[PDB]
């Protein structure tokens, strides 16, 4: 009844989807074979007459290796074989390759399977698009798919949980290029874009979970926990229920401004667990801590516009009200003058399930704080100069030109990002 269609595009998308679907299977009791030994799974799973539950997900990639890893691994009997869509040639970190030449047929087939999935949903809260801003498969093909979805489905709420390049550390060279291109693409298509940075999540794992060698599996586990906390109100009942549609209405002040920072709390390992109270006020403070945010973006530089809190577990509305009153009275946290409330609290009675073999400990309370704040303009300022430094010499421009782009596309994308900077300044200032 509250079905949500999940899209996982690119290597990062599919790898975070592995953790996400492992988490959902553990949460709902679904074995990896597909079936479990009410009707809370309908948000993420559609059940057949045989009793087996199949996810309403679509794994899209122009590279076959990542999808074949899922086809061979534990969740080979869970997913739909045709839902796993694989390309032949990788986008090779080329937004042009993934958006103009290779991505056409793959995205057409993706729309076909997405249509088959959406025809099986009574209600449809929206789409959860998980891609990697900074890679040809993620950026180009994800942008094209989002454009097609906006064209055909229309007003369905698309939530893009994008992974943006980190400020200093990175793994690619043309990452600012295709990041700027994808940002220009998704400024006008996705309804709420959640920013994520590998550097920030690495720092989180290092200082909180005490992992000196963090990896993508740990990062994806944390992201999956965040998404599960976000969607918990759709699957499990609790006081102050929040909806996917309510996210935008309580969180998006203006259509252009829909990029959001995310912070989960508490992030504690099994060893140091049960050593502190972990009360509601403490976990709210931890969520609002600048370090706990999953983007390398100091919130102290900007001003919070809206903050949606998703509380999980033994949480009472008076506790959340007192905690938010303390947060408002805190002087480090600064809100915009035009949003006196700026807060959207939603509680749920389902504590976060812990993945066996993971580093997170079993906590009876959890907070996912997703905030629209003007501080996020800082990361756009960083990518805006990381891009322009190469674009001055037109480095790697011929690579993008070869697959059907023009200098005008880069110019338009960069101008759009500058306009986004200006808009962020305008909303932040009185």
């Amino acid at each position: 009844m509250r079905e949500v269609i999940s899209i996982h595009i690119g290597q990062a998308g599919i790898q975070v989807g592995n953790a996400c679907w492992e988490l959902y299977c553990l949460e709902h009791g679904i074995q990896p074979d597909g079936q479990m030994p009410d009707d809370a799974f309908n948000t993420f799973f559609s059940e057949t007459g045989a009793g087996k539950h199949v996810p309403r997900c679509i794994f899209l990639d122009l590279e076959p290796t990542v999808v074949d890893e899922v086809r061979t691994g534990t969740y080979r009997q869970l997913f739909h074989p045709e839902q796993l869509i694989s390309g032949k040639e990788d986008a090779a970190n080329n937004f042009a390759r993934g958006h103009y030449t290779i991505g056409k047929e793959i995205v057409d087939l993706a729309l076909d399977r997405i249509r088959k999935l959406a025809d099986n949903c009574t209600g449809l809260q929206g789409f959860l698009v998980f891609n990697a801003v900074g890679g040809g498969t993620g950026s180009g093909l994800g942008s094209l798919l989002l454009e097609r979805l906006s064209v055909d489905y229309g007003k369905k709420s698309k939530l893009g949980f994008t992974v943006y390049p980190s400020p200093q550390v990175s793994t690619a060279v043309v990452e600012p290029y295709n990041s700027v291109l994808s940002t220009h693409s998704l400024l006008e298509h996705t309804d709420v874009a959640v920013m994520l940075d590998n550097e920030a999540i690495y720092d989180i794992c290092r200082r909180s979970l005490d992992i000196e060698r963090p990896t993508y599996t740990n990062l994806n586990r944390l992201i999956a926990q965040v998404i599960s906390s976000l969607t918990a109100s759709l699957r499990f009942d609790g006081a102050l229920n929040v909806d996917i549609t309510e996210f935008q209405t309580n969180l998006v002040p203006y259509p252009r401004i829909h990029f959001m920072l995310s912070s989960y709390a508490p992030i504690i390992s099994a060893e140091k667990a049960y050593h502190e109270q972990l009360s509601v006020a403490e976990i709210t403070n931890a969520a609002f801590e600048p370090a706990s945010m999953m983007v390398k973006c100091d919130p102290r530089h900007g001003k919070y516009m809206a903050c949606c809190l998703m509380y999980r577990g033994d949480v009472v509305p008076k506790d959340v009200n007192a905690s938010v009153a303390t947060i408002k009275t805190k002087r480090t946290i600064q809100f915009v003058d035009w949003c006196p409330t700026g807060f959207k609290c939603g509680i749920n009675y389902q504590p976060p399930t812990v993945v066996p073999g993971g580093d997170l400990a079993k906590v009876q309370r959890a907070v996912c704080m997703i905030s629209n704040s003007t501080a996020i303009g800082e990361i756009f300022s960083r990518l805006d100069h990381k891009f322009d430094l190469m674009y001055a010499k037109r480095a790697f421009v011929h690579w993008y030109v070869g697959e059907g782009m023009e200098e005008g596309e880069f110019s338009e994308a960069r101008e759009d990002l500058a306009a986004l900077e200006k808009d962020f300044e305008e909303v932040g200032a009185e």
Binding site: H385, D388, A392, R414
Partner: peptide, 22 residues
């Protein structure tokens, strides 16, 4: 950043100039 903004403006002006020449 201001440099590359003004560079894109210059590129647009050059494209307009070429179109006018055509």
């Amino acid at each position: 950043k201001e440099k590359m903004m003004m560079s894109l403006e210059r590129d647009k002006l050059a494209a307009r100039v070429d179109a006018l020449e055509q």
